[PDB]
């Protein structure tokens, strides 16, 4: 029923084309991507347990041609395995192409391609920051609501080979056991406080001791000793998260116990940051591939 290869081919054929060229799928094609990916999200666990090797990517925010560059340099599925950490939509000009390609690859390679929820995969955020406006302009309001029902089923965290804990935002003062994540039921909205909110919204901070108020007005900051205690208690080596723009595309925290990944270079056309993805090989050797406009 879903002409999945046709969709992917049309999404990929604009690579190198006229700058900023749209790919306009049909609304039935997009509804099909949402419906079939939603089934797959709900059939897989909300806390993904993954094996290496894979490549991990941070925020994209609708920068569709940067997403295509990520695949060009990292390897198009299924040449490489992927975990994305969220924030696919808003701010950029091509949220629709971005999310449609990610959902298509999720359907095409369901056990080798993974998408986590970011704080922008939430209707009360992406109504404001661009995605709803893009849906209304290029399709209609009903399609935006279809996306929301799909996003409400995204998984929330991943653990790679029992050593790398991955989520969009960060730690939570309410996260004592991984079972608390596994117990979250879907579909769900993102609440204004609590575990699920923190996993999508919190940030590390070099200046806080323990837990502090987050400048965003949502959730918390956490310091380097919170990170160390969490890793020791759960026998983990690394937290891998996204959510903050960082100048070099990746940024270490607390003596390599945490890394922030951000995959949208020159974010909003306002910053002069690189994008990065992290390659994790079969032995959990971790390295960075850095994408930057030439200067």
């Amino acid at each position: 029923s879903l002409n999945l290869d046709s969709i992917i081919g049309r999404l990929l054929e604009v690579q190198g084309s006229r700058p900023g060229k749209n790919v306009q799928l049909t609304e039935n094609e997009i509804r099909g991507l949402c419906l079939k990916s939603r089934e797959i999200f709900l059939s897989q666990p909300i806390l993904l347990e993954l094996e290496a090797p894979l490549k991990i990517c941070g925020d994209i925010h609708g920068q569709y041609y940067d997403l295509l560059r990520l695949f060009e340099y990292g390897g198009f599925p299924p040449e490489s395995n992927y975990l994305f950490l969220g924030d696919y939509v808003d701010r950029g000009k091509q949220s629709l192409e971005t999310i449609c390609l990610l959902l298509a690859y999720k359907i095409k390679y369901p056990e080798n391609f993974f998408l986590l929820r970011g704080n922008h995969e939430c209707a009360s955020i992406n109504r404001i920051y661009g995605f709803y406006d893009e849906c209304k302009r290029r399709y209609n309001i009903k399609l935006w609501k279809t996306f929301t029902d799909c996003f409400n089923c995204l998984p929330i965290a991943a653990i790679v080979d029992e050593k790398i804990f991955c989520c969009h935002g960060g730690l939570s003062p309410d996260l004592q056991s991984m079972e608390q994540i596994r117990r979250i039921m879907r579909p769900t909205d993102v609440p204004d406080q609590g575990l699920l909110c923190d996993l999508l919204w919190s940030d590390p901070d070099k200046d806080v001791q323990g837990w502090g108020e987050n400048d965003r007005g949502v959730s918390f900051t956490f310091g380097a000793e919170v990170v160390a205690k969490f890793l020791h208690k759960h026998d983990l080596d690394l937290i891998c998260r996204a959510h903050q723009v960082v100048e070099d595309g990746y940024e270490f925290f607390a003596k390599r116990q945490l890394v922030t990944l951000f995959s949208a270079p020159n974010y909003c056309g306002e910053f002069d940051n690189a994008g990065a993805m992290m390659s994790v090989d079969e032995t959990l050797m971790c390295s960075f591939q850095i994408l930057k406009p030439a200067d």
């Binding site: 090797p53 029992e162 020159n266 971790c286 390295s287 960075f288 591939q289 850095i290």
Partner: peptide, 26 residues
Amino acid sequence: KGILKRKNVHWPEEGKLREYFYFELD
């Protein structure tokens, strides 16, 4: 060949940590 279900995270030498890709912006 799916990856959905004792190792240790480690890092390369400093010169092999980053691989750069440059692109022309329009």
